[PDB]
Amino acid sequence: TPTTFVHLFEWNWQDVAQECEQYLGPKGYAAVQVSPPNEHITGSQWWTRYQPVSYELQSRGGNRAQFIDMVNRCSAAGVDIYVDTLINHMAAGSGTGTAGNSFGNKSFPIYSPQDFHESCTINNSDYGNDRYRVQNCELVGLADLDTASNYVQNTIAAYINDLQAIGVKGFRFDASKHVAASDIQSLMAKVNGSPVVFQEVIDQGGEAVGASEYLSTGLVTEFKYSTELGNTFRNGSLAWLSNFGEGWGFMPSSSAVVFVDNHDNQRGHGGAGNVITFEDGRLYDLANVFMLAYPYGYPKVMSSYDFHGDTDAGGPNVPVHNNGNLECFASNWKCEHRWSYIAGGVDFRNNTADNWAVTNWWDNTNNQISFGRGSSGHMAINKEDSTLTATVQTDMASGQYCNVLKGELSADAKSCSGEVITVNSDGTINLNIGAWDAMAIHKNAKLN
Ligand SMILES: [Ca+2]
């Protein structure tokens, strides 16, 4: 069952299409969130994508034909496409777009100065005590669209509807906090059918505008998850995660999009240094394994590029699929979605989707934990400095299982490529997990 999606950050349309056929589809990823496909300002920085010029599908990722080709090919592979949609603003200042269009002084090919709110600057203190300014003023100089305007709502809705006609199945509403929930409600009334919509709302608490305000218009990014997970993994005890989720004050599980990190917070925007990223190696593996095994939210796996400490830099000057060579795992594209523990966690989540309870939780009061998903699967994480050798109780059928974090079941089901885990006749497992390692087994990766 499809349960997880991935963000192919700055991946061009040809690389995504190929990734869908060769990897995402076969491995079970539900969908792909692509970078903004519309016309945006010129420049090499990754953030140019967040300054729209028009809704023409001519961007750094490719042209309209390549985009349509990507949707079709991904769709055939069983993978949906979610489009990062800019509903709050247009480009700042003046200049030229990726499709040749000129703009300037809030004058764009599809909007006039009258289609924007009167200019004012959002100040940091406005977040805590002035919802009017947060939603009507400019976010770092970006022209703030008058989202209450029928013309503006029709224009954005037409774009969304055009994407659905092409085959796009979902949408990410960028900077949703900066748009009144009621404006989004009016917008959605113009959207055909019921596509998957998730809204970016950064709410760690103490904001004038809250995440709960967007629950009736779709899913909402739960930023507390990323921050607390990172904080617990680095500075706390894993034992504390036994009631992670609503128990910690998070929004309803069925309404949340969760992640270890995202394109913003891995660069210091919306997250401090406690956020765990690819740079943390094995710590990142372990954090993803917990997220993917734990039954809270709709997880989004991150797929980054090594930015070499430059938080403004755009992606690599080389494609992922480069003349038969895969530009992954090194100093270009990181391809975390292909990392063994991460793809294995996705497999675990996909095969335990028939039991969303956390069963038989066990911990050593500190950094060793183990829990099951009923008789569908079991997992354990060892973040201590000594081997985890405890005997844990599971509800699983006795037999031999492939530790899916380190390998997989062969076609004929007679062998695994990685280590084997034995479930004894009484349902127990005598663990043998080294420091900073983990194991996960499920009913669909059982031997012979
Ligand atoms: Ca706004």
Angle at Cα 296 formed by Cα 293 and Cα 301, nearest 5°? 65
Can you tell me the distance from the alpha carbon of 15 to that of 25, in angstroms, rounded to the nearest whole number?
14
Can you tell me the distance from the alpha carbon of 367 to that of 156, in angstroms, rounded to the nearest whole number?
48
Quick one: tokens of 444? 């669909």
Can you tell me the distance from the alpha carbon of 276 to that of 262, in angstroms, rounded to the nearest whole number?
10
Instruction: Name all domains of the chain by residue range, CATH numbers in brackets.
Output: 1-354 (3.20.20.80), 355-447 (2.60.40.1180)
279 as an active site residue: the answer is: no
| 92 contacts 140 by C-beta, under 8 angstroms | yes
Can you tell me the distance from the alpha carbon of 267 to that of 272, in angstroms, rounded to the nearest whole number?
9
174 as an active site residue: the answer is: yes
Can you tell me the distance from the alpha carbon of 97 to that of 351, in angstroms, rounded to the nearest whole number?
45
Exactly one of 56, 183, 200, 261 is catalytic; which is it?
A: 200
The HSE-up count of residue 6 (CA atoms within 13 Å, CB side) is: 27
SS3 at position 323: coil
Q: Which residues of 215-229 are buried (b: 16+ CB within 10 A; e: fewer)?
A: bebbbbbbbbbbbbb
SS3 at position 219: strand
Tell me, what amino acid is at 158?
A
The HSE-up count of residue 192 (CA atoms within 13 Å, CB side) is: 12
Exactly one of 174, 213, 222, 336 is catalytic; which is it?
A: 174
DSSP 361-413: EEE-SSSEEEEEBTBTEEEEEE-SSS-B--EEE--PPSEEEE-TTT--B-TTS
Can you tell me the distance from the alpha carbon of 83 to that of 7, in angstroms, rounded to the nearest whole number?
10
Shortest CA distance to 373 belongs to which of 3, 80, 79? 3
Method of determination is X-ray
Orientation angle between helical segments 150-166 and 64-76, nearest 10 degrees: 50
Can you tell me the distance from the alpha carbon of 381 to that of 436, in angstroms, rounded to the nearest whole number?
7
| 13 contacts 67 by C-beta, under 8 angstroms | yes
DSSP 242-307: GG-SGGGTPPPGGGEEE-S--TTGGGTSS--TTS--GGGTHHHHHHHHHHHHS-SSEEEEEE-B--
Q: Name the resolution in angstroms.
A: 2.1
Tell me, what amino acid is at 310?
D
Can you tell me the distance from the alpha carbon of 353 to that of 359, in angstroms, rounded to the nearest whole number?
14
How many angstroms separate the alpha carbon of residue 173 from the centre of ligand 1?
A: 12
Q: H or E segment at 181?
A: helix 181-188
* Residue reference for tokens 């949906």: 80
* 51 annotated to bind ligand: yes
| 357 contacts 374 by C-beta, under 8 angstroms | yes
How many angstroms separate the alpha carbon of residue 143 from the centre of ligand 1?
A: 9
Strands 143-144 and 219-221: unpaired
Residues 6 or more apart whose CB falls under 8 angstroms from that of 152 comprise 111, 115, 145, 146
The torsion angles phi and psi of 389, rounded to 5 degrees, stand at -120, 20
Can you tell me the distance from the alpha carbon of 241 to that of 229, in angstroms, rounded to the nearest whole number?
8
* 89 annotated to bind ligand: yes
* 300 annotated to bind ligand: yes
How many angstroms separate the alpha carbon of residue 313 from the centre of ligand 1?
A: 26
Quick one: tokens of 320? 């992922």
Burial (Cβ within 10 Å: 0-12, 13-18, ≥19) of residue 234 = middle
Task: Tell how far CA 242 is from the center of its chain.
Answer: 23
How many angstroms separate the alpha carbon of residue 180 from the centre of ligand 1?
A: 7
